Amino acid sequence: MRTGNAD
Amino acid sequence: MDYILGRYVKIARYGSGGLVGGGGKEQYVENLVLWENIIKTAYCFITPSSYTAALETANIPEKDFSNCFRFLKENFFIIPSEYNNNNRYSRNFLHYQSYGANPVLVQDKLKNAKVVILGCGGIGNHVSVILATSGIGEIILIDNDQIENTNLTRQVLFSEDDVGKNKTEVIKRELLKRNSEISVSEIALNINDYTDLHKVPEADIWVVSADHPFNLINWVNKYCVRANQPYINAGYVNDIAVFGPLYVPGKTGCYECQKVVADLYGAEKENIDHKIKLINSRFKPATFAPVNNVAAALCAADVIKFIGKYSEPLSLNKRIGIWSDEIKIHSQNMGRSPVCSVCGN
Numbered sequence: 001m002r003t004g005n006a007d
Numbered sequence: 008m009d010y011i012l013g014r015y016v017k018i019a020r021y022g023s024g025g026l027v028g029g030g031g032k033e034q035y036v037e038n039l040v041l042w043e044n045i046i047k048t049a050y051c052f053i054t055p056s057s058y059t060a061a062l063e064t065a066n067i068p069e070k071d072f073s074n075c076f077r078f079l080k081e082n083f084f085i086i087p088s089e090y091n092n093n094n095r096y097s098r099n100f101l102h103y104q105s106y107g108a109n110p111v112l113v114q115d116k117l118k119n120a121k122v123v124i125l126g127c128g129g130i131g132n133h134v135s136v137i138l139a140t141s142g143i144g145e146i147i148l149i150d151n152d153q154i155e156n157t158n159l160t161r162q163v164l165f166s167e168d169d170v171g172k173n174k175t176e177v178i179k180r181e182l183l184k185r186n187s188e189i190s191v192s193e194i195a196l197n198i199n200d201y202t203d204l205h206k207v208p209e210a211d212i213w214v215v216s217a218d219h220p221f222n223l224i225n226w227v228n229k230y231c232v233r234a235n236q237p238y239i240n241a242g243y244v245n246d247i248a249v250f251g252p253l254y255v256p257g258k259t260g261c262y263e264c265q266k267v268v269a270d271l272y273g274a275e276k277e278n279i280d281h282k283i284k285l286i287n288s289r290f291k292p293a294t295f296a297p298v299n300n301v302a303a304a305l306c307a308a309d310v311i312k313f314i315g316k317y318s319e320p321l322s323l324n325k326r327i328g329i330w331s332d333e334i335k336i337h338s339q340n341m342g343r344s345p346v347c348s349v350c351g352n
Protein backbone atom coordinates (compact mmCIF):
# COMPACT_ATOMS: atom_id res chain seq x y z
CA MET A 1 0.00 0.00 0.00
CA ARG A 2 3.11 2.30 -0.80
CA THR A 3 1.25 3.37 -4.04
CA GLY A 4 -2.09 5.17 -4.45
CA ASN A 5 -5.44 3.50 -4.28
CA ALA A 6 -8.11 2.71 -6.92
CA ASP A 7 -11.89 2.68 -5.99
CA MET B 8 -31.52 10.90 37.60
CA ASP B 9 -33.33 7.81 36.18
CA TYR B 10 -31.06 5.25 34.52
CA ILE B 11 -31.90 2.31 32.24
CA LEU B 12 -30.01 -0.83 31.16
CA GLY B 13 -29.10 -0.62 27.47
CA ARG B 14 -30.67 -3.33 25.29
CA TYR B 15 -27.09 -4.06 24.00
CA VAL B 16 -26.06 -5.59 27.34
CA LYS B 17 -25.64 -9.36 27.45
CA ILE B 18 -24.28 -11.63 30.20
CA ALA B 19 -22.44 -14.98 30.14
CA ARG B 20 -20.51 -17.29 32.42
CA TYR B 21 -16.87 -17.62 31.29
CA GLY B 22 -13.61 -19.06 32.74
CA SER B 23 -13.27 -18.39 36.45
CA GLY B 24 -15.96 -15.65 36.39
CA GLY B 25 -18.19 -14.04 33.85
CA LEU B 26 -18.63 -11.60 31.06
CA VAL B 27 -20.65 -8.42 31.04
CA GLY B 28 -21.30 -6.63 27.79
CA GLY B 29 -20.29 -7.21 24.21
CA GLY B 30 -17.94 -5.50 21.73
CA GLY B 31 -15.01 -3.16 22.59
CA LYS B 32 -16.36 -2.57 26.15
CA GLU B 33 -16.91 -6.26 27.01
CA GLN B 34 -15.58 -6.89 30.53
CA TYR B 35 -14.29 -10.12 31.96
CA VAL B 36 -14.92 -10.25 35.73
CA GLU B 37 -12.85 -13.04 37.26
CA ASN B 38 -14.38 -12.47 40.71
CA LEU B 39 -17.60 -14.53 40.60
CA VAL B 40 -19.10 -12.79 43.57
CA LEU B 41 -18.58 -9.41 41.94
CA TRP B 42 -20.02 -10.72 38.60
CA GLU B 43 -23.16 -11.92 40.46
CA ASN B 44 -23.51 -8.53 42.16
CA ILE B 45 -23.10 -6.67 38.84
CA ILE B 46 -25.99 -8.82 37.47
CA LYS B 47 -28.19 -8.00 40.49
CA THR B 48 -27.38 -4.29 40.06
CA ALA B 49 -28.00 -4.39 36.29
CA TYR B 50 -31.36 -6.06 36.85
CA CYS B 51 -32.58 -3.10 38.95
CA PHE B 52 -32.39 -0.87 35.86
CA ILE B 53 -34.44 -2.92 33.35
CA THR B 54 -37.11 -0.22 33.90
CA PRO B 55 -36.05 3.44 34.42
CA SER B 56 -34.89 3.79 37.99
CA SER B 57 -32.90 6.17 40.24
CA TYR B 58 -29.79 5.01 42.09
CA THR B 59 -31.75 5.19 45.39
CA ALA B 60 -34.83 3.31 44.06
CA ALA B 61 -32.49 0.54 42.85
CA LEU B 62 -30.43 0.59 46.12
CA GLU B 63 -33.84 0.06 47.94
CA THR B 64 -34.55 -3.30 46.21
CA ALA B 65 -31.03 -4.65 45.32
CA ASN B 66 -30.50 -6.53 48.63
CA ILE B 67 -26.71 -6.26 48.55
CA PRO B 68 -24.50 -3.92 50.64
CA GLU B 69 -24.45 -0.30 49.47
CA LYS B 70 -20.61 -0.51 49.17
CA ASP B 71 -21.00 -3.36 46.61
CA PHE B 72 -23.94 -1.71 44.81
CA SER B 73 -21.97 1.55 44.43
CA ASN B 74 -19.01 -0.33 42.88
CA CYS B 75 -21.34 -2.25 40.49
CA PHE B 76 -23.23 0.87 39.48
CA ARG B 77 -19.91 2.73 38.67
CA PHE B 78 -18.82 -0.31 36.64
CA LEU B 79 -22.06 -0.41 34.60
CA LYS B 80 -21.99 3.38 34.08
CA GLU B 81 -18.34 3.71 32.99
CA ASN B 82 -18.97 1.11 30.24
CA PHE B 83 -22.31 2.80 29.15
CA PHE B 84 -24.15 -0.43 30.11
CA ILE B 85 -26.56 1.77 32.04
CA ILE B 86 -27.46 5.07 30.41
CA PRO B 87 -29.68 8.05 31.23
CA SER B 88 -33.33 7.13 30.74
CA GLU B 89 -33.41 10.49 28.78
CA TYR B 90 -31.38 8.76 26.01
CA ASN B 91 -33.89 5.93 25.42
CA ASN B 92 -37.21 7.22 24.01
CA ASN B 93 -41.71 3.68 15.40
CA ASN B 94 -38.02 4.62 14.54
CA ARG B 95 -36.34 3.33 11.33
CA TYR B 96 -32.90 4.24 12.84
CA SER B 97 -33.55 2.41 16.14
CA ARG B 98 -30.63 -0.12 15.69
CA ASN B 99 -28.23 2.75 14.98
CA PHE B 100 -29.62 4.41 18.17
CA LEU B 101 -28.32 1.39 20.16
CA HIS B 102 -24.89 1.90 18.59
CA TYR B 103 -24.83 5.64 19.60
CA GLN B 104 -26.11 4.85 23.16
CA SER B 105 -23.33 2.30 23.56
CA TYR B 106 -20.75 5.16 23.28
CA GLY B 107 -22.50 7.30 25.97
CA ALA B 108 -24.20 9.51 23.35
CA ASN B 109 -27.76 10.90 23.15
CA PRO B 110 -28.90 9.09 19.95
CA VAL B 111 -31.45 11.79 18.99
CA LEU B 112 -28.68 14.50 18.94
CA VAL B 113 -26.43 12.30 16.78
CA GLN B 114 -29.33 11.62 14.40
CA ASP B 115 -30.02 15.37 14.20
CA LYS B 116 -26.42 16.03 13.12
CA LEU B 117 -26.69 13.37 10.39
CA LYS B 118 -30.02 14.80 9.19
CA ASN B 119 -28.49 18.33 8.89
CA ALA B 120 -25.36 17.09 7.03
CA LYS B 121 -24.45 17.23 3.34
CA VAL B 122 -22.06 14.71 1.86
CA VAL B 123 -20.46 14.61 -1.64
CA ILE B 124 -19.75 11.21 -3.18
CA LEU B 125 -17.01 11.90 -5.75
CA GLY B 126 -17.04 8.68 -7.76
CA CYS B 127 -20.02 6.32 -7.95
CA GLY B 128 -18.28 3.00 -8.56
CA GLY B 129 -17.45 0.22 -6.08
CA ILE B 130 -16.56 2.38 -3.13
CA GLY B 131 -19.18 5.01 -3.93
CA ASN B 132 -21.99 2.48 -4.16
CA HIS B 133 -21.30 0.99 -0.76
CA VAL B 134 -20.62 4.26 1.09
CA SER B 135 -23.68 6.05 -0.36
CA VAL B 136 -26.16 3.36 0.69
CA ILE B 137 -24.79 3.18 4.24
CA LEU B 138 -25.02 6.95 4.57
CA ALA B 139 -28.52 7.11 3.03
CA THR B 140 -29.89 4.40 5.27
CA SER B 141 -28.20 5.96 8.34
CA GLY B 142 -30.09 9.21 7.57
CA ILE B 143 -27.47 11.58 6.14
CA GLY B 144 -29.86 14.32 4.99
CA GLU B 145 -28.30 15.34 1.65
CA ILE B 146 -26.18 13.26 -0.70
CA ILE B 147 -24.59 14.66 -3.91
CA LEU B 148 -23.50 12.03 -6.43
CA ILE B 149 -20.73 12.90 -8.94
CA ASP B 150 -19.72 10.68 -11.84
CA ASN B 151 -19.89 10.69 -15.62
CA ASP B 152 -19.73 6.93 -16.28
CA GLN B 153 -22.24 4.38 -17.57
CA ILE B 154 -22.94 1.00 -15.95
CA GLU B 155 -21.15 -2.02 -17.45
CA ASN B 156 -21.77 -5.67 -16.83
CA THR B 157 -18.33 -6.13 -15.12
CA ASN B 158 -19.37 -3.51 -12.55
CA LEU B 159 -21.96 -5.89 -10.98
CA THR B 160 -19.33 -7.80 -8.90
CA ARG B 161 -18.87 -4.79 -6.46
CA GLN B 162 -21.40 -2.05 -7.41
CA VAL B 163 -24.20 -3.40 -5.32
CA LEU B 164 -26.92 -0.91 -6.24
CA PHE B 165 -26.78 -1.93 -9.94
CA SER B 166 -28.74 -4.76 -11.64
CA GLU B 167 -28.40 -6.40 -15.03
CA ASP B 168 -31.33 -4.27 -16.27
CA ASP B 169 -29.26 -1.17 -15.44
CA VAL B 170 -26.37 -1.87 -17.86
CA GLY B 171 -25.86 1.19 -20.11
CA LYS B 172 -27.61 3.63 -17.74
CA ASN B 173 -25.79 6.43 -15.92
CA LYS B 174 -24.34 5.53 -12.50
CA THR B 175 -25.56 8.69 -10.76
CA GLU B 176 -29.15 8.13 -11.93
CA VAL B 177 -29.30 4.52 -10.76
CA ILE B 178 -27.61 5.21 -7.40
CA LYS B 179 -30.12 8.04 -6.85
CA ARG B 180 -33.10 5.76 -7.69
CA GLU B 181 -31.84 2.99 -5.40
CA LEU B 182 -30.98 5.33 -2.49
CA LEU B 183 -34.46 6.89 -2.56
CA LYS B 184 -36.05 3.43 -2.70
CA ARG B 185 -34.21 2.67 0.57
CA ASN B 186 -34.73 6.01 2.32
CA SER B 187 -37.30 8.38 0.86
CA GLU B 188 -36.81 10.86 3.78
CA ILE B 189 -33.44 12.17 2.42
CA SER B 190 -32.39 14.43 -0.49
CA VAL B 191 -30.19 13.16 -3.36
CA SER B 192 -28.86 15.15 -6.31
CA GLU B 193 -26.58 14.27 -9.25
CA ILE B 194 -23.71 16.11 -11.02
CA ALA B 195 -22.39 14.70 -14.35
CA LEU B 196 -18.70 15.51 -14.16
CA ASN B 197 -15.33 13.97 -14.90
CA ILE B 198 -12.53 15.72 -13.03
CA ASN B 199 -9.81 15.46 -15.71
CA ASP B 200 -8.07 18.73 -14.72
CA TYR B 201 -7.41 20.34 -11.34
CA THR B 202 -9.66 23.27 -12.23
CA ASP B 203 -12.76 21.04 -12.55
CA LEU B 204 -12.76 20.71 -8.69
CA HIS B 205 -14.27 24.23 -8.62
CA LYS B 206 -17.48 22.54 -9.94
CA VAL B 207 -17.75 20.32 -6.84
CA PRO B 208 -20.02 21.84 -4.14
CA GLU B 209 -18.90 22.57 -0.58
CA ALA B 210 -20.22 20.02 1.92
CA ASP B 211 -19.69 18.74 5.48
CA ILE B 212 -17.26 16.17 3.94
CA TRP B 213 -16.26 14.83 0.56
CA VAL B 214 -16.03 11.13 0.06
CA VAL B 215 -13.22 10.77 -2.46
CA SER B 216 -14.03 7.51 -4.25
CA ALA B 217 -12.66 8.39 -7.73
CA ASP B 218 -9.27 7.27 -8.98
CA HIS B 219 -8.33 8.75 -12.43
CA PRO B 220 -5.73 10.04 -12.97
CA PHE B 221 -3.24 8.52 -10.52
CA ASN B 222 -2.72 12.07 -9.11
CA LEU B 223 -6.41 12.94 -8.66
CA ILE B 224 -5.94 12.36 -4.94
CA ASN B 225 -3.10 14.96 -5.03
CA TRP B 226 -5.37 17.46 -6.78
CA VAL B 227 -8.24 16.82 -4.33
CA ASN B 228 -5.93 17.14 -1.36
CA LYS B 229 -4.49 20.51 -2.53
CA TYR B 230 -7.95 21.85 -3.45
CA CYS B 231 -9.46 20.78 -0.08
CA VAL B 232 -6.60 22.34 1.92
CA ARG B 233 -7.07 25.61 -0.04
CA ALA B 234 -10.92 25.45 0.23
CA ASN B 235 -11.14 24.46 3.98
CA GLN B 236 -13.05 21.30 2.86
CA PRO B 237 -12.86 18.06 4.91
CA TYR B 238 -12.48 14.83 2.89
CA ILE B 239 -11.90 11.14 3.31
CA ASN B 240 -10.24 8.87 0.72
CA ALA B 241 -10.96 5.13 0.44
CA GLY B 242 -10.32 2.30 -1.95
CA TYR B 243 -7.84 -0.50 -2.46
CA VAL B 244 -4.42 -1.31 -3.77
CA ASN B 245 -5.30 -4.60 -5.45
CA ASP B 246 -6.06 -7.01 -2.53
CA ILE B 247 -5.44 -4.46 0.29
CA ALA B 248 -8.47 -2.46 1.46
CA VAL B 249 -7.49 1.18 2.23
CA PHE B 250 -9.35 3.95 4.04
CA GLY B 251 -8.12 7.28 5.16
CA PRO B 252 -6.82 9.76 5.55
CA LEU B 253 -9.73 11.77 6.95
CA TYR B 254 -8.47 15.32 6.30
CA VAL B 255 -9.86 17.98 8.67
CA PRO B 256 -8.70 21.61 8.02
CA GLY B 257 -6.19 22.82 10.61
CA LYS B 258 -6.44 19.57 12.65
CA THR B 259 -5.13 16.54 10.83
CA GLY B 260 -2.32 15.91 8.37
CA CYS B 261 -2.99 16.06 4.65
CA TYR B 262 -2.11 13.41 2.03
CA GLU B 263 1.37 15.02 1.45
CA CYS B 264 2.41 15.82 5.04
CA GLN B 265 4.33 12.56 5.45
CA LYS B 266 6.18 11.00 2.55
CA VAL B 267 5.06 7.40 2.78
CA VAL B 268 3.15 6.85 -0.49
CA ALA B 269 5.07 6.88 -3.83
CA ASP B 270 4.42 10.05 -5.84
CA LEU B 271 6.75 9.54 -8.86
CA TYR B 272 4.96 7.09 -11.17
CA GLY B 273 7.85 7.35 -13.57
CA ALA B 274 11.64 7.65 -13.96
CA GLU B 275 14.26 10.42 -14.37
CA LYS B 276 15.27 8.46 -17.52
CA GLU B 277 12.84 9.33 -20.35
CA ASN B 278 13.15 5.89 -22.03
CA ILE B 279 12.27 4.11 -18.80
CA ASP B 280 9.65 6.76 -17.93
CA HIS B 281 7.64 6.09 -21.11
CA LYS B 282 7.69 2.31 -20.30
CA ILE B 283 6.44 2.98 -16.78
CA LYS B 284 3.69 5.31 -18.00
CA LEU B 285 2.47 2.73 -20.47
CA ILE B 286 2.38 -0.08 -17.86
CA ASN B 287 0.58 2.21 -15.37
CA SER B 288 -1.91 3.41 -18.03
CA ARG B 289 -2.76 -0.26 -18.76
CA PHE B 290 -3.16 -0.98 -15.01
CA LYS B 291 -6.51 -2.42 -13.94
CA PRO B 292 -6.80 -3.25 -10.20
CA ALA B 293 -7.43 -6.85 -9.29
CA THR B 294 -10.83 -5.80 -7.74
CA PHE B 295 -12.49 -8.26 -5.34
CA ALA B 296 -15.89 -7.32 -3.75
CA PRO B 297 -14.78 -8.30 -0.18
CA VAL B 298 -11.80 -5.83 -0.40
CA ASN B 299 -13.98 -3.13 -1.91
CA ASN B 300 -16.72 -3.61 0.71
CA VAL B 301 -14.32 -3.52 3.73
CA ALA B 302 -12.80 -0.24 2.57
CA ALA B 303 -16.18 1.27 1.82
CA ALA B 304 -17.65 0.13 5.16
CA LEU B 305 -14.91 1.59 7.30
CA CYS B 306 -14.94 4.81 5.20
CA ALA B 307 -18.70 5.19 5.85
CA ALA B 308 -18.11 4.56 9.61
CA ASP B 309 -15.63 7.44 9.76
CA VAL B 310 -18.09 9.79 7.92
CA ILE B 311 -20.88 8.93 10.42
CA LYS B 312 -18.49 9.48 13.37
CA PHE B 313 -17.03 12.68 11.90
CA ILE B 314 -20.53 14.17 11.50
CA GLY B 315 -22.16 12.52 14.55
CA LYS B 316 -19.32 13.39 17.02
CA TYR B 317 -20.05 10.40 19.35
CA SER B 318 -16.73 8.58 18.75
CA GLU B 319 -13.43 9.49 17.04
CA PRO B 320 -12.97 8.43 13.37
CA LEU B 321 -10.21 5.81 12.98
CA SER B 322 -8.57 7.50 9.96
CA LEU B 323 -7.70 10.90 11.48
CA ASN B 324 -3.96 11.31 10.64
CA LYS B 325 -3.83 7.75 9.19
CA ARG B 326 -4.11 5.85 5.91
CA ILE B 327 -5.19 2.38 7.05
CA GLY B 328 -4.70 -0.89 5.11
CA ILE B 329 -6.50 -4.13 5.78
CA TRP B 330 -4.92 -7.14 4.04
CA SER B 331 -7.18 -9.80 2.56
CA ASP B 332 -4.60 -12.59 2.01
CA GLU B 333 -3.35 -12.53 5.57
CA ILE B 334 -4.51 -11.21 8.94
CA LYS B 335 -3.07 -7.67 9.07
CA ILE B 336 -4.16 -4.07 9.67
CA HIS B 337 -1.44 -1.43 9.27
CA SER B 338 -1.64 2.42 9.55
CA GLN B 339 0.58 4.80 7.60
CA ASN B 340 1.18 7.89 9.70
CA MET B 341 -0.25 11.01 8.01
CA GLY B 342 0.02 13.38 11.01
CA ARG B 343 0.48 17.11 10.43
CA SER B 344 3.97 18.30 9.39
CA PRO B 345 4.80 21.99 10.17
CA VAL B 346 6.96 21.80 7.01
CA CYS B 347 4.25 20.36 4.68
CA SER B 348 4.57 22.22 1.35
CA VAL B 349 0.77 21.96 0.95
CA CYS B 350 -0.85 22.53 4.35
CA GLY B 351 1.96 23.81 6.63
CA ASN B 352 0.79 26.55 9.13
Ligand SMILES: *NP(=O)(O)OC[C@H]1O[C@@H](n2cnc3c(N)ncnc32)[C@H](O)[C@@H]1O
Pocket residue numbers: 006007125126127128129130131149150151152174196197198199216217218219220223
Ligand atom coordinates in the same frame (compact mmCIF):
# COMPACT_ATOMS: atom_id res chain seq x y z
N1 LIG C 1 -12.91 2.28 -8.17
P1 LIG C 1 -14.16 2.09 -9.31
O1 LIG C 1 -15.04 0.92 -8.90
O2 LIG C 1 -13.45 2.00 -10.62
O3 LIG C 1 -15.09 3.37 -9.18
C1 LIG C 1 -14.46 4.65 -9.51
C2 LIG C 1 -15.63 5.58 -9.91
O4 LIG C 1 -15.14 6.78 -9.93
C3 LIG C 1 -15.37 7.37 -11.42
N2 LIG C 1 -14.25 8.25 -11.64
C4 LIG C 1 -12.96 7.93 -11.70
N3 LIG C 1 -12.22 9.00 -11.89
C5 LIG C 1 -13.06 10.06 -11.93
C6 LIG C 1 -12.89 11.42 -12.08
N4 LIG C 1 -11.56 11.97 -12.29
N5 LIG C 1 -13.93 12.21 -12.07
C7 LIG C 1 -15.17 11.73 -11.89
N6 LIG C 1 -15.38 10.45 -11.75
C8 LIG C 1 -14.32 9.61 -11.76
C9 LIG C 1 -15.47 6.31 -12.22
O5 LIG C 1 -16.36 6.66 -13.35
C10 LIG C 1 -16.13 5.17 -11.33
O6 LIG C 1 -17.50 5.03 -11.39
Ligand SMILES: [Mg+2]
Pocket residue numbers: 007128
Ligand atom coordinates in the same frame (compact mmCIF):
# COMPACT_ATOMS: atom_id res chain seq x y z
MG1 LIG D 1 -12.57 2.09 -12.46
Ligand SMILES: [Mg+2]
Pocket residue numbers: 152153155
Ligand atom coordinates in the same frame (compact mmCIF):
# COMPACT_ATOMS: atom_id res chain seq x y z
MG1 LIG E 1 -16.80 2.09 -16.02
Ligand SMILES: [Zn+2]
Pocket residue numbers: 260261262263264265343344347348349350351
Ligand atom coordinates in the same frame (compact mmCIF):
# COMPACT_ATOMS: atom_id res chain seq x y z
ZN1 LIG F 1 0.11 18.47 4.65
